[PDB]
């Protein structure tokens, strides 16, 4: 699953976590098997 986000919200992308992006538009299952991988993209995605 590929998407861009504000660096503050990386914390919410986990099984059982909460807040607007996890509540609305990207929800993980509580029994998730997987990896969450993220990096700063201020050099690419900012203008």
């Amino acid at each position: 699953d590929s998407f861009v986000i504000r660096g503050d919200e990386v914390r919410q992308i986990a099984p059982g976590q909460t807040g607007k992006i996890a509540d609305y538009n990207y929800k993980l299952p509580d029994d998730f098997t997987g990896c969450v991988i993220a990096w700063n993209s201020n050099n690419l995605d900012s203008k």
């Binding site: 503050d8 909460t18 807040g19 607007k20």
Partner: protein
């Protein structure tokens, strides 16, 4: 206040909309202990002290 002389505000006889606090992106931490911040609207207290 200064941490040597912190101020305590009693909160009582009122309705507490805790999601207005928890959703505020300005807060660098919101660590809760004997309660989870999502549950606070379902739950209530004799007093709260800030």
């Amino acid at each position: 206040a200064s941490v040597y002389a912190w101020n305590r505000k009693r909160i009582s006889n009122c309705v507490a909309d805790y999601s207005v606090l928890y959703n505020s992106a300005s807060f660098s931490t919101f660590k809760c202990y004997g309660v989870s911040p999502t549950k606070l609207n379902d739950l209530c207290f004799t007093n709260v002290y800030a």
